[PDB]
Symmetry: D2
């Protein structure tokens, strides 16, 4: 199967598969059952911001999520990504809905990776998404262009989110995260999102993920599986 | 045919097709016959540096080439790239040899493009090239990995350059150079090169080019055609 | 006196000193009488954005100003800044009011300068201004901290702008814009502004300027002189 | 006294004050007695490179030093810099010699700091130092301009290093490392150095440091005190 490393923004508590009894952020290593979670005070209809950072010296994957005029939520986990991911990877965003639903809108997205030997770099930034974004790989129900935004999951014309939807968006160019002569390897990611729902129980969430370059959406990965994992193991 | 906009580092004077009677730098717009040239004091076996800049406000393509401890050579040309190139393009480097030969080695390469609306950006930088550079499209005789360098044209094991060779290297991800809401569009490119030859008459040169995303090497474009143009029209 | 190179956002037409009969943007070279102007459709109470660019190869100072959902205004002028400005300079923002008044609020400010020899760089970015901005030199009535913004001219507690006011803000560190070994020198500036006024005739405007490191506000430079020039010569 | 946080490149083992019995790199927190050290295979007359990184989420100060064609040395230490340093600081480089001596030459220096709230940034880069570097504060015997390099300690005309010397170089503009609304604060530093000595026992070393904005060289801080600390407590 695919190799997945992801930071999940989980809006629906599936307590039967390890989720806490509240909206949360988590670090997923090849499993939907997070290795580490933190309580997330999610706000319906508000624009949020997420930061993800990592470097090969400290070997620590940390993430910070916040809303304007509010306190932030953070979570960290010690993991050597060189022992999990291949040398060449692709980065992207994923989201899903099930019987419960929500809008999974992305307003902006930036990413930067550095390889310092004894310096190679890649940086891209989207502040608006065009109708034909040729430097993005869209999978599933993901579409671009609507109000210059990226809609990961299906949304009707009236602006109402649909259930049983799943979509992913990956950057076109592969990313080099390890090299034999490298002394320091690091990356940082930032994206702004807008989750809206007419229901009192939104679902299922958004995730930033890193995977093998030929990764595709697993079958039946709608709902709680966030379009990343084939099962709940 | 392909749409080509290139800055040529011409080492061999082909006076029958418009070249001046000396090594030169030039601006090529859909033709090997440069719209504008400048005298270039090329140095055999020395590492040089080239800078290329452009923005949509001034609509001026300028280039600067220099060696350490020496005076620089520069050339500019007024041209609206929006009236020549498509909305989505690819960028890359090209080189060739004919009956006369030279080494076309690339030591480093950086590129940055900006789209500011009423900001989207792409930046990559190579200071060393690996054996399997997955984020590069290699065409022709171009190879990577040899001493961490990029060899555009064929070079034997003893380090001797071969004749009748041609090779190009393009960045994997397409580049967005125009948008309907953009108020300012700009890009800058920089690469370091090493041209070596045991002969008194090296040939044929190196070029940085911009083209349609599906561009490939034209037939019989070795030698004076720099692997960019099908003929000398 | 001081050496001033500035891009003016002129909101009040002083036709007796060369101004066109409408709000305009202009390039000022050691004089308030602009060398080049362009019509500016200024919008009261709306957030605008200004871009300024220059490089030593083309020797062209260009500026672009725009509002959301509207067409932009642009102006360019050919000038060798090496023949006008000293080797070391300071950059900053200036504004003024006279008998007519307006708010001169700055929401963000970014600047980048590059010196490439045969590479030295400086970059700073403000997206919010703190109460004690130690890396800024405040002159006149300029204050920081109010709603995280930079107020160049005097504004009362109720949010009403005051007349006969003048204020400037300069970056603390000097900027190197020329070097003997430099082959390419360039800079770009961007700032967002908010001009509000209860009157039908706002005044007097905002300007981005470059000057000698020890520049201060000239006496009686309120109103039409934009806090940059001692007289209207 | 001054508040000092520094990463030392210690070339001379002063075992009576806590040094290991070999050249080493260390993390100094308000004391010359390092909180954490690592063995450093220093090479006389070779150009080295040092990387220093930190962020407010992980609260971990890590450093990596390496030479070409050789294995690297690294050291990390958990410390909350918000509980040690003031809100506004200055960054710089320091070096010293005693009865034993060495050249403390700096070839390049880059620094980047980020403040992300619920983004402010500062970045500068020196690849060559001019005779009159107005954006640097030179203290002690530090001079700029010699072969475009920065000589922290005294060197005679013949290129021979002098004993009992001390010099520091700080960036002119203050740096903001903490803010009440900040959710993520980080910085990274990189500099290349050349340590040469005709002796078999070079001394005393080079250090990158962070301090209060009004920091100056302590009396009698030559030799083992690296020009940072008043005593060996
Ligand atoms: Ca869940
Ligand atoms: Ca030719
Ligand atoms: Ca006026
Ligand atoms: Ca010591
Ligand atoms: Mg979960
Ligand atoms: Mg030619
Ligand atoms: Mg005017
Ligand atoms: Mg020590």
């Amino acid at each position: 199967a695919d190799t997945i490393v992801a930071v999940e923004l989980d809006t629906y508590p599936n307590t039967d598969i390890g989720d806490p009894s509240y909206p949360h952020i988590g670090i997923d290593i090849k499993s939907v059952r997070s290795k580490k979670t933190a309580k997330w005070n999610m706000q319906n209809g508000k624009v949020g911001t997420a930061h993800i950072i990592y470097n090969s010296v400290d070997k620590r994957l940390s993430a910070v999520v916040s809303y304007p005029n509010a306190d932030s939520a953070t979570v960290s986990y010690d993991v050597d990504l060189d022992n999990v991911l291949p040398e060449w990877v692709r980065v992207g965003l994923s989201a899903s809905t099930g019987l419960y639903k929500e809008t999974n809108t992305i307003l902006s997205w930036s990413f930067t990776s550095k390889l310092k030997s004894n310096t190679n770099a890649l940086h891209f930034m989207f502040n608006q998404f065009s109708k034909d974004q040729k430097d993005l790989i869209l999978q599933g129900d993901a579409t671009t262009g609507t109000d210059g935004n990226l809609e990961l999951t299906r949304v009707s014309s009236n602006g109402s989110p649909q259930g049983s939807s799943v979509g992913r968006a990956l950057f076109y160019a592969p990313v080099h995260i390890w090299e034999s002569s490298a002394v320091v390897a690091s990356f940082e990611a930032t994206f702004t999102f807008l989750i809206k729902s007419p229901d009192s129980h939104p679902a299922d969430g958004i995730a930033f993920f890193i995977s093998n370059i030929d990764s595709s959406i697993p079958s039946g990965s709608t709902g709680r599986l966030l379009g990343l994992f084939p099962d709940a193991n």
